[PDB]
Amino acid sequence: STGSATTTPIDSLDDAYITPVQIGTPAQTLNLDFDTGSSDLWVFSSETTASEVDGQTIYTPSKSTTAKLLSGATWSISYGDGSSSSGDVYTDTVSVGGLTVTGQAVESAKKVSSSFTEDSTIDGLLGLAFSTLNTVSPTQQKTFFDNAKASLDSPVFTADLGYHAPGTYNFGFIDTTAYTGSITYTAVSTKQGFWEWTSTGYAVGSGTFKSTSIDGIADTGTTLLYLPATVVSAYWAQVSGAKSSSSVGGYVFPCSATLPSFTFGVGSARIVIPGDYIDFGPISTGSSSCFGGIQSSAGIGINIFGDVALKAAFVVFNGATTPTLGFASK
Numbered sequence: 001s002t003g004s005a006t007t008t009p010i011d012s013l014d015d016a017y018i019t020p021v022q023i024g025t026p027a028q029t030l031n032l033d034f035d036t037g038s039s040d041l042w043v044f045s046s047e048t049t050a051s052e053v054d055g056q057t058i059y060t061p062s063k064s065t066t067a068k069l070l071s072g073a074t075w076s077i078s079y080g081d082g083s084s085s086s087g088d089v090y091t092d093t094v095s096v097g098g099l100t101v102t103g104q105a106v107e108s109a110k111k112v113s114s115s116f117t118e119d120s121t122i123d124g125l126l127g128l129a130f131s132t133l134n135t136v137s138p139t140q141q142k143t144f145f146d147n148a149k150a151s152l153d154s155p156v157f158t159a160d161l162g163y164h165a166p167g168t169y170n171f172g173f174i175d176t177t178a179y180t181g182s183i184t185y186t187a188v189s190t191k192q193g194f195w196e197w198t199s200t201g202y203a204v205g206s207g208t209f210k211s212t213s214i215d216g217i218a219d220t221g222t223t224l225l226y227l228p229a230t231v232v233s234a235y236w237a238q239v240s241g242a243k244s245s246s247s248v249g250g251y252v253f254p255c256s257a258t259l260p261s262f263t264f265g266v267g268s269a270r271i272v273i274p275g276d277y278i279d280f281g282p283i284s285t286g287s288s289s290c291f292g293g294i295q296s297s298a299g300i301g302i303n304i305f306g307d308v309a310l311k312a313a314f315v316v317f318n319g320a321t322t323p324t325l326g327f328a329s330k
Contacts, residue, residue, distance in 0.1 A: 001151045002172035003099025007034065007161065010121040013280055014307060015223050017161060018121060019169055022095040023106055024064030030057050030123035034169055035221030036159070036195055036317065037304075039133035039143050040077050041094070042085055042107035043124035044116075052112050055120030061108065067092045075107045075135045080222065080300065083115040089136055094144060096126075099171050101148050105134075105141035125221070128157065128317065133193035145171070145319060155319045159220055160330070161311035163277055179314035179328035184269035188323045192302075194219070195317060197325050199305075200267060202227075204235050205260030209270070216303030218310060218317070218325055224280070225262075225273070226297035226304040235262055235294050242292070248283050251292040255282060262294060264309060266327040273312040 007017040018031040023043070030043055044053060046060040061067035067090045076086035087110035094104040109124070116122065127134070131142045149155045152172035160178050161167040168178070189196045194217040203209040214227065232251065236242040238260050242253035253259070259275030278293035293308045316326030 001099055001148075002153055002170070003095075003097035003148075004168060004170045005097030006166050007169055008166045009162065009164065010119070012164070014161075014164060014311065016122065017167070017220070017307070018123075019096070019126070021126060023059055024061070024092045025066040026064075027095070028057075028059055028064065030059060031121065032124050032126040033122050033221060034126045034128055034159075035219070036128040037217060037219035037221045038077065038079065038125065039127040039129045039131055039193065040075060040107050040135055041105065041124070041126045041144055042075065042077070042087070042109055044112070045087070045108040047087060048109045049111055052117045054117050057123045059106065059108065059124075061090045061092065061106075064092055066102075067106075070105060070136075070139075073105075073136050073139060073141075075137070077135045080304075081115065083113045085109045085112040085116060087111065089141070096144065096171065097169065099148055099152075101144055104144055104147055105136060107136065128220070129195065130190050130193045132190070145317075148172075149319055157317050157319070159310060159315045159317065161220070161307055163274075163311050167311070174316060179330045181329055183314070183316060183326040183328040184266045185316070185318070185324045185326045186266050188325055190323060194302075195323070195325055200265030202231055202265065203263040203270075204238050205275075207238075209263065209265070211265075214264075214303055216297075216305050218315060219304050219306050220310060222304045222306030223308070224304075224306050225278075225294045225308040226300055226306065227294060228303065229296045229298045232294055232296045235260070236292065244296075248289070248291070250295040252283060252289045253292055255288045255290040257290070264305075269327065271309070271313045271327055271329060273309060277308055277312060
């Protein structure tokens with residue numbers, strides 16, 4: 001089997017992407033944030049504290065003939081941005097882009113933090129990291145991909161995120177029309193539960209490439225590119241007036257700037273992030289200070305190849321017995 005679903009930016013900045021997901025019988029379609037940096041499929045639901053729901057579409061398990069309480073199971077998750085959610089668990093039929101999994105753990109939120117409430121466009125998350133990170137207790141649950149894997153034509157999914165435009169998540173096949181040139185594959189460590197890999201270096205604009213190993217994670221659920229402070233300083237030094245602002249929470253730059261590109265290495269291959277991808281617009285409405293899309297990972301504890309990086313590439317998440325990651329230009 002295979003699946004193919006379009007993923008759509010939630011706003012004009014590509015802050016996140018939503019993908020429609022069918023849950024239950026008859027189908028309830030919710031728009032979920034596919035997150036290769038976590039491993040829980042959770043939804044706003046009929047159980048979510050009413051004051052914490054503001055415009056989201058909810059899953060109502062009592063209206064699904066295939067829903068079953070997973071008795072005694074609870075979940076609770078905290079994300080890198082400080083947001084969180086928790087609740088109980090149902091199993092139900094879940095379909096993405098025509099690919100169906102029966103008996104998927106659907107984690108029903110009883111509570112969500114303010115950031116989730118305030119974002120009316122995201123109805124929940126669909127985790128695509130390794131199932132070892134799943135938070136369900138006392139019986140850890142598998143991701144949608146892990147459950148689907150055996151049925152897939154090939155044990156892979158791909159992320160093809162758009163810049164200010166829709167893109168695609170495919171399951172079970174590689175669309176050879178969706179990228180240019182060849183795909184370069186690189187080793188993955190699953191030791192921390194992430195799609196963790198080592199970039200071979202970087203360049204700023206038309207500058208020379210610096211060969212240096214940068215360990216980080218491919219994380220579709222993180223908006224920006226977070227890299228070591230040395231790398232980030234080298235990038236922003238090429239933008240007149242750019243500076244790190246503790247009050248704003250990162251590097252800002254004059255909105256009048258033209259940003260240089262940023263290149264990262266994948267083996268001997270190179271992925272170029274155009275300068276425009278690094279512009280996250282005014283820090284507050286009408287400001288002439290703009291927020292940068294490359295930020296320091298210092299104090300996160302890990303480097304993160306988030307959407308800014310991934311949307312410059314066609315990315316293969318190869319879930320074979322020895323997982324790997326592939327990157328192609330597009």
